[PDB]
Nucleic acid binder design. Sequence first.
DNA 1: ACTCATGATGCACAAGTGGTTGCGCGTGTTC
DNA 2: GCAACCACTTGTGCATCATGAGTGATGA
Lengths: 93, 93, 305, 292, 280, 241
Amino acid sequence: MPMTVITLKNVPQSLRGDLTRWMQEIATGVYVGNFNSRIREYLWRRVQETMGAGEASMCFAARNELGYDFLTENASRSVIDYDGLPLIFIPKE
Amino acid sequence: MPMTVITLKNVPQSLRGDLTRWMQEIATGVYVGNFNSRIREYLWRRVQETMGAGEASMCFAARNELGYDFLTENASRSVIDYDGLPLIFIPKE
Amino acid sequence: AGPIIAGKSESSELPRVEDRATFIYIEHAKINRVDSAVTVAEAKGVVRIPAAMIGVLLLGPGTDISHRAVELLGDTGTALVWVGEQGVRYYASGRALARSTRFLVKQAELVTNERSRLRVARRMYQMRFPTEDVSKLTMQQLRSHEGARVRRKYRELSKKYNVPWKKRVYNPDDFAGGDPINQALSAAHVALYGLVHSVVAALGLSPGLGFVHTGHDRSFIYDVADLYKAEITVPIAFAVAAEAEEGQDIGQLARLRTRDAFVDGKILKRMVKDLQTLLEIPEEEPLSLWDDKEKLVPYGVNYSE
Amino acid sequence: DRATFIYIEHAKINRVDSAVTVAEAKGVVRIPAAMIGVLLLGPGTDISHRAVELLGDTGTALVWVGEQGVRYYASGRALARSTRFLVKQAELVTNERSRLRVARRMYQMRFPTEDVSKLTMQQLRSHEGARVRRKYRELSKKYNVPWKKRVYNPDDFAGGDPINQALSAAHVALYGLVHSVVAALGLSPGLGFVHTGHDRSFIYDVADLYKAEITVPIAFAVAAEAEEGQDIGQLARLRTRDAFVDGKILKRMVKDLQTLLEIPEEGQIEAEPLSLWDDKEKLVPYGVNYSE
Amino acid sequence: PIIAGKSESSELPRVEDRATFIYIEHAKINRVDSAVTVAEAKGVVRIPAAMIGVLLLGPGTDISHRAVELLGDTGTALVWVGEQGVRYYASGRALARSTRFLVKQAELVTNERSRLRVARRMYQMRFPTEDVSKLTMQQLRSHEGARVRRKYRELSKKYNVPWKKRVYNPDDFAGGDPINQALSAAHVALYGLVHSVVAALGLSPGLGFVHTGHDRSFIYDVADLYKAEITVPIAFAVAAEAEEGQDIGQLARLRTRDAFVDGKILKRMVKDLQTLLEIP
Amino acid sequence: DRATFIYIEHAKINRVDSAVTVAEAKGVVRIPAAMIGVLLLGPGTDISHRAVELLGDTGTALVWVGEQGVRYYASGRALARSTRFLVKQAELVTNERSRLRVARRMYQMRPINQALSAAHVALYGLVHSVVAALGLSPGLGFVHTGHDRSFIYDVADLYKAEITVPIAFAVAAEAEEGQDIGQLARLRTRDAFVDGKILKRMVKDLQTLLEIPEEGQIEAEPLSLWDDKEKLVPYGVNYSE
DNA sequence: ACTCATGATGCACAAGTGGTTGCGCGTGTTC
DNA sequence: GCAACCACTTGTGCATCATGAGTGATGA
């Protein structure tokens, strides 16, 4: 099973504890767990309407030549497609 | 190639930029990348000799029921073994 | 679908019964739900349990668990078993995360019919001992023969590892021991029984509708666990007893090797498939009304006039 | 032949020698384990390992419930590990003759003034539909609550009339009590007679016996005396738990379950919904110590 | 010791196991905190240079000295893919410390019979349905040209795109047509990948067999093995499916990266570079 | 037959039409691209894409070096993208007779430990810069074989005994206690390399070792942008401040 | 001109403590 | 009694800025 990584910040503490039921916390707001496509999709679905006014970013194994892809919703660091290659973009203040 | 995740905080900026040459930084201090055992071991050895007075924790795919195992060096959250199942232990102040 | 809230999860969002981890053992701690998380709070620190990935949670001595923690564990499909000393002490589980009772209906139809029950017991005996043929054995003969061969296996494994065994058989009803072999056997068996109880509660099967064991609410748990107690728990416990040295926690290493054997033997998927085949269920809204002429009738409808 | 259904909430249960120690806010109570038949651990309950071990040694049925059993969360083994009710239910539901008889008996329980021993399943379900329509209409007339048709969404509770929300909440509270009683008695919630294919078919079958008598009037009263913007579901659940406080409903449920399973009256058990601080006088002679 | 910004070849992924290419334009490649950082007006993108073989530098890229040093340290070759073809090459020290491949390539390029045999194998690999056991050097050039124009014409007719009877050349191939842009983008990606692989394996890019006279001849020879198989059909498909207002270069690079991943051109390229030089 | 070796450091190179533009602290220098030859881009260099394109059009060998070529970091193509020197070196190295002859020719031509290592590494960097600019393959070495820089080591052995050794011994004698001897050795080696005579001699010996005919040889011109303004003004190199 | 180390300097976010409310998560005879 | 929400302090670390020092990673 692909390893799914979710990072939460400025989210309600309820979701902070809720994600621990599926995937553990290795650092403040960092989660890692092994799931298939369906469980991962449902878990990101749960995170989307539980994070409130917070930032969530998820990384999972994909079928690109880097080997992973990114899903972010209302996050500081967006993801830009450099010709079929996912690279993390950090906007400048 | 299994997915590997390294989390850094309170580390020199040199290491923060150096790990971006191997694995991308989705959020502050957390890195994601797909490497084999040799590259991951070399990256962890590089982290151990560059963070100095900092904390680092790495997550990678393993061959247990949870599917992953954890390596931490002077990290706030340690890792303890529950009958062969790695679960994150958060010390109480 | 519907609104998503912390602490409550649907069956789809959870892993399959055969895709989860086997068990976790907690002792001298205090399971407690803080911020919608099953948290194990020991003296030193707090440990968060990924209950969605855990099939059964084993509660040892000195373990305190709250009401909301039990509700959360039941919601995640994780079963609760108080694995104290002298074996399993109690069972607990929430609603089954399988909304279809087809497995339970088939199990009831098989257990009520005497010929079907005898056939199912013969199938279990054949699965335990594939080489033999039991097409003519009766129920009492089946029980006596299974006891005799379990005792023979215990004696053989005691001889192999050179450990003193007092011609005894493990039994969840009041089995106590102080020897390291007894402790290892108890640990492996309680882990197996917790896993079996979790699987049965997850599939919707009734733990009381047993075929070989009768007289209690966990007879089917014993029946399912006997299919594997001799092939994993006994040899692994004997190996643990042989390997154990002075000043070593027998339970810790016994459970470690029990989990290793469960993973290597693929006990979880094997148990799911064995329960599939034992009930003679071919591979394939759940609620409906019952009728004689039309069989099932759609529910949630009002029949006027 | 007597089973006590003890309800515990807002307490920490431990064990001393052979008695559970319910450390309430009022004080400490020392119920002997042997007298407890069914333990209904309500909200705010911290159960210990030794308490669970002692209660399971004496065949107590631990059921983690809501406030007065409105919600069923988890349950342990059966009352005295008695699977005779479960075996009887499985035998009754397996074949069509006993299933027909039990369905007729439940429909008769729902039809005191009519004889339905000759009606078919189609006729029986039509009669129940007519009965529930008439009950809804007459309760709407009595409580001055407008009523058009039972409309609701299992996935969208917010969108709906207050009467429908109250009905759903009260029915689910009744379902929780039914499941608590069933798990205490050792019955299988999935082995249903009229309802089939669901993991709580028997729960709905049993709760349908009390819907038209308990939860529907409660829901109509809640809808009548409700302000706009008020939590209708919480109100209905609280009213249902208040109705369940007495314990008469639970005893009636145990008796009706044993009647449905054709259990002979000699072998039938009697539920005793005991309370701790409201029944001190009854429990003192039984050995139940009290502290303050 | 381990110093930030410096790594051994062992710590880097093999040539096969890394990504193919990254294209950068209208940016400023820079090194901050020992990271290969690509700074745009809106923000900065930090490149995992250890996971990419070649970095294509499009128009508007201003790369610094230390950024080039870091990219060479990671083994990521640099190519300035401007308009009308590859414009300049760059590469650091080879991350292969053995020159067995280089010595073998030298000893098969100096010998005339060895050069003939290597060109024979490359023709056989490009066209396995023919026989060239007695075919000579200039005849090999003429046959290669005839077949590349035949492939170009066949693909132009198949995808229904007007082609002006030409074959892409790395030197001064300018065109405003969508087919010209797609061919240039796919070909510069291929040439950058070939240059990266050659620099990574320790081979000399100047020791060519069919192409001679310049220091990038072996690059052209290696790229010819895959030019007609992958890049030309990809460019023709891109021109066929291109819409109005769609950036030809971006979609062409999408398609050529997809072809490289599907065709396994990296592992295949290393394997071919092994077989052409007879390494058992 | 003139191959200028312009060393640019602390600058930002952009392109004006058919002329690169070097903007240092002293001022802005415009150079026609045809006379660049070898462009040694030292530290602090920010080369632009359009300047790279212009330099590539004119057969420029861009080599990213350290301070006065102490360290070799990266290199582009060769002089006029020519491979005659590389082909000659390959022909000499594959066969045994020419390899033995060239090895014999090299032999005929030919704290303290830390200083020696630093000086040798500086010489390696300069030799690699020259070799990459000329188009020679650093791996094809005659005396040394089996390494990526074998030819670099062979060429550096020519100058080890009379440049790096005296500098290393001088810095070892002059070293103060608790001082970075490697940095001192590198700085003294770059100071020695400032004049550029060593670069000319390396180019001359590289051409000689390949038996390149004297008529067809090209001579190195270690051009300085500011120290040689009077030499570049007639060449068309505009200056500004 | 580049890059890194360093010193202020501020700021977003997390973890703790403190009372206060509630006991919770709502389909199954609705087309 | 338990657990979530909430206010509110308290604190750790990150990012920016300005200054000054180096041009660097050191094997035949």
